[PDB]
Design an enzyme around this catalytic site. Structure first.
Site, PDB file in Angstrom:
ATOM      1  N   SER D 161       0.824  -1.200   0.000  1.00  0.00           N
ATOM      2  CA  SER D 161       0.000   0.000   0.000  1.00  0.00           C
ATOM      3  C   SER D 161       0.860   1.253   0.000  1.00  0.00           C
ATOM      4  O   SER D 161       1.835   1.354   0.751  1.00  0.00           O
ATOM      5  CB  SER D 161      -0.919   0.029   1.209  1.00  0.00           C
ATOM      6  OG  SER D 161      -1.852   1.093   1.099  1.00  0.00           O
ATOM      7  N   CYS D 162       0.463   2.228  -0.809  1.00  0.00           N
ATOM      8  CA  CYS D 162       1.219   3.459  -0.950  1.00  0.00           C
ATOM      9  C   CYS D 162       0.289   4.658  -0.824  1.00  0.00           C
ATOM     10  O   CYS D 162      -0.886   4.597  -1.197  1.00  0.00           O
ATOM     11  CB  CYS D 162       1.957   3.500  -2.283  1.00  0.00           C
ATOM     12  SG  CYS D 162       2.971   4.972  -2.508  1.00  0.00           S
ATOM     13  N   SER D 163       0.833   5.747  -0.281  1.00  0.00           N
ATOM     14  CA  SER D 163       0.042   6.950  -0.061  1.00  0.00           C
ATOM     15  C   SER D 163      -0.418   7.549  -1.389  1.00  0.00           C
ATOM     16  O   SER D 163       0.318   7.545  -2.379  1.00  0.00           O
ATOM     17  CB  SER D 163       0.862   7.959   0.740  1.00  0.00           C
ATOM     18  OG  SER D 163       0.364   9.283   0.606  1.00  0.00           O
ATOM     19  N   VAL D 164      -1.668   8.019  -1.417  1.00  0.00           N
ATOM     20  CA  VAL D 164      -2.246   8.574  -2.631  1.00  0.00           C
ATOM     21  C   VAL D 164      -1.529   9.830  -3.101  1.00  0.00           C
ATOM     22  O   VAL D 164      -1.749  10.275  -4.235  1.00  0.00           O
ATOM     23  CB  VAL D 164      -3.750   8.853  -2.428  1.00  0.00           C
ATOM     24  CG1 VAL D 164      -3.952  10.183  -1.732  1.00  0.00           C
ATOM     25  CG2 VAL D 164      -4.467   8.860  -3.771  1.00  0.00           C
ATOM     26  N   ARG D 167       0.174   9.949  -6.601  1.00  0.00           N
ATOM     27  CA  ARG D 167      -0.531  10.078  -7.873  1.00  0.00           C
ATOM     28  C   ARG D 167      -0.704  11.523  -8.336  1.00  0.00           C
ATOM     29  O   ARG D 167      -1.267  11.755  -9.412  1.00  0.00           O
ATOM     30  CB  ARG D 167      -1.894   9.368  -7.801  1.00  0.00           C
ATOM     31  CG  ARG D 167      -1.805   7.848  -7.620  1.00  0.00           C
ATOM     32  CD  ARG D 167      -1.625   7.382  -6.197  1.00  0.00           C
ATOM     33  NE  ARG D 167      -2.145   6.026  -6.032  1.00  0.00           N
ATOM     34  CZ  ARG D 167      -1.680   5.132  -5.163  1.00  0.00           C
ATOM     35  NH1 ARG D 167      -0.665   5.438  -4.367  1.00  0.00           N
ATOM     36  NH2 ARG D 167      -2.239   3.929  -5.085  1.00  0.00           N
TER      37      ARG D 167
END
Ligand SMILES: [Mn+2]
Ligand SMILES: [Mn+2]
Lengths: 250, 268, 249, 245, 241, 263
Positions: D161-164, D167
């Site tokens: 999981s990666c922080s939005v 993007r």
């Protein structure tokens, strides 16, 4: 410098020769040569010759022979045994030369036999022909590709072989010996692939490996035929059937 | 008979031999023999040997030896020069035998020096069997273990981690009669590791001199198209002149229909 | 309650029953039941039963029987003839009820013969299970799906059948009569498709038309198999072999 | 050395701390720490904390909190306002720092209030206020997996999981609306069968990164993705020819 | 409605005009016009003009000028500076109008200067005589071949302005960048293609039926358009239009 | 033997007939016949007849009629009610015959009233097929079509809509419109050669196998679109269009045994 003067040079040379034998491939060049020769010398003074051999498909020979008849020419098939020459049979890089020497040699024998003054081919401005003495009248009149299309439209010529084919020797590595069987099997493989809807194709020969070259834009479309191509080429004698990831002319 | 007796006969043989050297592959069979030997004989009475060679990846060897250390065996690495035997270097159809003969010969020499009474393997010709000529004992085979009895008892002993995909000698990527070299072996294994890094764990790069012939599971060939150009230039920089993909795929013929599978078998 | 109480309630129920027969599918629920039975009563007092039938594949049957044996259980296969009941053979919406009537009946007979006090399945917190006196012990202890996996991790269970299996009746429309030949036809077709690398697959039966459902994300991977799938399924008796553009369900 | 030695060092370290608060994401690393913490100290000496924020999905938050109770922990959720800090809201290249500062600050306050001796996270080999016992015991990605099967752990979040924030370009301001726009897009792409995906935000252009091995499988969805992401507000919906990263 | 009556209608119109300047694109329409004027009026009364500009490819310019000489016409290239008009340089939604204004003005001047009675173009169903003679797409092919015409430009082009958003300023460098991108894409076997310009993002429009065939080119297209100056190279999921 | 003789025999047969009516489909065979009749007999001795019916699309009818007058022929439309005949309306295996009998009957009537000596059609190797009498093959038709400058014709062979329904299924205006709307939609996506076979609630799409890979990007819209036309399931036939013609030697023979299983 104008097409009219270049066409004048071609008509004059043909009137000078009086009777010619034309090496006829079905291409736009030799179609233009054979049509100008018929117009200036008449049908009884021109012999169109189509070479039949293993190195080219039996189907392309039929195509060239019909296109000569459609122009109104007396056409004559001659059969060449290219494999009889050891330079061609062992596929050395000079095979292209001994093949072309044996071709023009046969053209001179029939032109001696029919009383023609020259052999004509279809070479333009863009080593064996000059050795035997064949004449490229379009090259002598400074025809370029644009002048050939220009005079072809002036004369109403619309039908010729639009793709020109290569000798089947190109599917074999230098040093590999060509046989009657491996030539025939290479050509069945390519005829089958063409039958599936891939006009531009090569089956490179590597003994027990077939190496298929396709335009890369067609390989996605080719996946649905993988298994049929694989088993069809094995029934032709290949042990392994493969597809080159480099595409056409890697 | 029943699994209680089969493990009993296995313990009786182990108790009788007292000190053993175990050929350890990292597989579930050799994991089961070496852990039962530990439970019956203890650490100073068992030596686990893991063979290193050019025919298998450096990653399998590091892994098989760690899995043996993780079970608590005194473990020893051995490097075998399979290419010194001409049957293996010229890739004869029987080089599998001469490979196993040189392997068991080195294991017996290790077992002679450490004072073990037998060499045990994880088993569940041009002459005598390589085992029978060397004196080795397959104790699961004498106890009539099957694949499920190994799996049944492996949990019963708490065994969880082993090499699950199994290996194949890199000699299988070369035709019979092709001579194996240090350079071309490195060439196939670099090729397969690059293909694996792209997301195709099951792959083969068969060596055909200047032609590389890639076998993939046919179900992945559609997914493979986006890598064609990178695969071709990567394997060309590894030394292949031509890089090709076999249209039969990995295990050509196992995923064909009744009639066309019999046609694919006739051609071989 | 806490998972310690639920496992405590489960051990007490098993200890009282002393001898048991477990209906075993290979799923996580029956796996947790059969492993708790092995640990509480021992291998000699628990019998695992796995149902074989025309409505389910021999491949799902083989998997459940190794798993039961891999858990340290003595496992025994039974074959059921579901098509003898016409409610199943004419494929009405209550077909699964009469199927389950025949399943629990054969289980009751096995438990009488080996001296078991009850038949256990892996049902958590139904009409036919009750009329045969079967006991669902995970449901009696208020196990939920989270309690099932929670105790499955406490016991070191990692390996089970992740794909719940559906009866072959779903490949025929309601009202179509099931026969031995058309049942065999669908399952051979699906066994072939799965062997190509498509575990999730259905071949819907439309008389002479076979309609293949695949996950839409897998249809691209399938293209290389069009020709072999088309001829294999015709040799199984279909006139037309088709691919549904709507995908799976 | 051997995984047994690495596991022993971790057990001794946990016994020394006696009371721990565990930062739990639901991944395999924090799942392995939190189950070892439970296994060595018991349910009442361990507090599992799951961070809820706007930069991570609600679906990941719900899953980790359910996975914590299934592992046998007392679990509590704490909400973080990453966008309240101007460094994070303006998406500077140093936004990571203030997020990690804010994150560990909130964990330290929960651990002070419940009397734990340290905050633990799931960081391996390859932040002062928190101890990474897997990294201190020299666990690698292979050793984490190795011990996770030894303990029967099967259920966790399999895709990292990666922080939005990743993007949006550096310098773009994060809003509640554009975050919601990316998340709805990635949630829809995930529902079609692509767990690993990114929807990079370029105002009116959406730039979808997929694993290159999946782009061929993706063609059958081109048309539905193009209309769903337009109804979310993108004018152009595109697929990046470089793939994921 | 007989191809003979339509050609007779066309031959009658040309005889009335006497001397003509023909706007020549190299397509079959302008090819059929340019030859028909030569056949009825002779080389010395027909001038074919081929426009050179940055909004169209150098290859389309070079091809049309050779193909007109191949038809036997006196051919003349004229260079247009479309970017000199502020509507074209700033790519306004009405800039298409000002572009055609500079084009037809320059042709008209040429036709005034050589004494032609009209400028003719190749628009089917200024003077569009093929449009006045009720030629359809099929009637052009039937009559072209009739005179022996086989060689022309089949890929009809469009102004490169369509690859830029309204309001974006056209420069020589970004125009050169879009057309280099499209020439590379066409060379791989995709004749119908667009590279839409979005500053650092390239957005490739392909016919949706070709997107599957395109997959094997992803990586080199990605690196090729980056070396041309794009930071991101993408493919539009809606396809061409 | 030579193409000139085949064109020579063709010119001789036409000169004897004097006045002819040509059954014109728009394909390369009838296009080559209709021009050759015009060239030897002139516009006043040739009448091109183009059949319109419910069984063929309005678009192939329109294209054939423009091509007949554009070749310089006086052309006249004739409308046939194929569905009035019960063999065709219930799609019996002999429907093609009763279609062709009703077709040639009307052609004989038009030729009687305008004073023609024969009706000519385009069938190769009381109607007369002059191409078949002149020993033309597919190859001689294309060659002589190029010799006359003919470029425009109906390139995707046209077929009766009856072929998309199983034998015995009765054709209605609703199911015919359903098949042709389905096929017209598929064509607009870039598949000129396509069949939508009707199987009650199942549509079975046959495509050339070389296009099926390209088709994936349309799966869902084709599925939605054909359901709104009345199909419950929209499927793709894995054998494709003209299954077997492009398979290997062994596979083509097996598929031919499967095709001959039905009648
Ligand atoms: Mn394609
Ligand atoms: Mn895939």
């Amino acid at each position: 410098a104008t097409l009219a003067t270049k066409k004048a040079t071609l008509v004059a040379a043909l009137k000078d020769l009086q009777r010619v034998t034309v090496a006829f491939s079905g291409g736009i060049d030799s179609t233009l040569v054979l049509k100008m020769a018929l117009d200036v010398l008449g049908r009884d003074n021109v012999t169109a010759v189509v070479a039949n051999s293993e190195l080219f498909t039996d189907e392309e020979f039929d195509k060239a022979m019909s296109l000569a008849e459609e122009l109104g020419a007396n056409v004559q098939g001659t059969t060449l045994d290219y494999l009889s020459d050891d330079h061609i049979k062992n596929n050395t890089p000079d095979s292209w030369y001994y093949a072309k020497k044996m071709f023009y040699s046969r053209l001179n024998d029939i032109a001696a036999n029919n009383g023609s003054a020259a052999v004509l081919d279809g070479m333009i401005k863009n080593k064996a022909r000059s050795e035997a003495g064949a004449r490229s009248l379009l090259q002598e009149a400074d025809f370029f590709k644009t002048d050939v299309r220009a005079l072809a439209q002036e004369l109403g010529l619309t039908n010729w072989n639009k793709v020109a084919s290569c000798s089947v020797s190109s599917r074999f590595p230098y040093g590999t010996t060509l046989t009657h069987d491996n030539i025939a099997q290479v050509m069945a493989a390519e005829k089958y692939l063409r039958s599936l809807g891939f006009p531009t194709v090569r089956v490179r020969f590597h003994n027990d490996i077939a190496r298929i070259e396709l335009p890369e834009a067609r390989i996605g479309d080719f996946l649905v035929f993988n298994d049929r191509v694989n088993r069809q080429l094995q029934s032709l004698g290949f042990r392994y059937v493969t597809l080159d990831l480099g595409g056409f002319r890697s």
